[PDB]
Design a binder for this molecule. Sequence first.
Ligand SMILES: CC(C)(C)OC(=O)N1CCC(CC(=O)N2CCc3c(c(-c4ccc(Cl)c(I)c4)nn3CCCN3CCOCC3)C2)CC1
Length: 221
Amino acid sequence: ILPDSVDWREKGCVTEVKYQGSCGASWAFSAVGALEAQLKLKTGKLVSLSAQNLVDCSTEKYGNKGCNGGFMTTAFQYIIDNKGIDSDASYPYKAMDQKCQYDSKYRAATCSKYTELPYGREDVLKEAVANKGPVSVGVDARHPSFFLYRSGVYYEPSCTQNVNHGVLVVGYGDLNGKEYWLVKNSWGHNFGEEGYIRMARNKGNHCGIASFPSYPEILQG
Ligand SMILES: CC(C)(C)OC(=O)N1CCC(CC(=O)N2CCc3c(c(-c4ccc(Cl)c(I)c4)nn3CCCN3CCOCC3)C2)CC1
């Protein structure tokens, strides 16, 4: 029996909401967000990791296209291959494609492995959020209602299971008669609930939230 609700912000495992601007780098923010939580669990320190590092350096070999989109899972593979990722402080976000400037002197995290969860399984996603930490997911965000969301549990009848926007599931719950996923976005603090959106849960893989989940791990050693 899983907890009725989870919120990894309450364990100090979630950094401030970021603002991607005109650069389509949500995949990079989702990836660093998932890795930030594992880093805090392992080291006790909460430090924002460089989404710009991924935009500039996790490119064609990883199937990623910087400000034109990418994947959280291949971002994790880049961090594994590169043996590190810089802090956001040392390598801050510029919302444009730049030359790779990774510097091991400012490495703030590593990645050992990642896990991909099965397509559409919200029960498996619930277990991973409860037992492993925040989970990178894609959602279908191509609806005016998503851009216009302010509060409550989001439900868009015309949503599809085909994803196009990377976000971070940091928890789940059940409030006001509605089950939801707690989602950290990267559209700044003025979007939604202080930068978060609660999305309908157990409504048939609504907006594809459980289509392509993945999470990284940092192992001892
Ligand atoms: C007409 C053509 C043939 C072009 O497409 C279709 O027929 N489609 C379009 C795609 C539809 C399915 C779908 O949503 N995804 C296709 C499969 C997919 C998508 C995402 C994903 C995750 C997070 C985010 Cl944020 C985003 I953004 C995407 N992860 N994965 C899993 C494999 C990713 N790869 C990356 C490279 O290394 C190998 C593994 C998007 C099905 C219908």
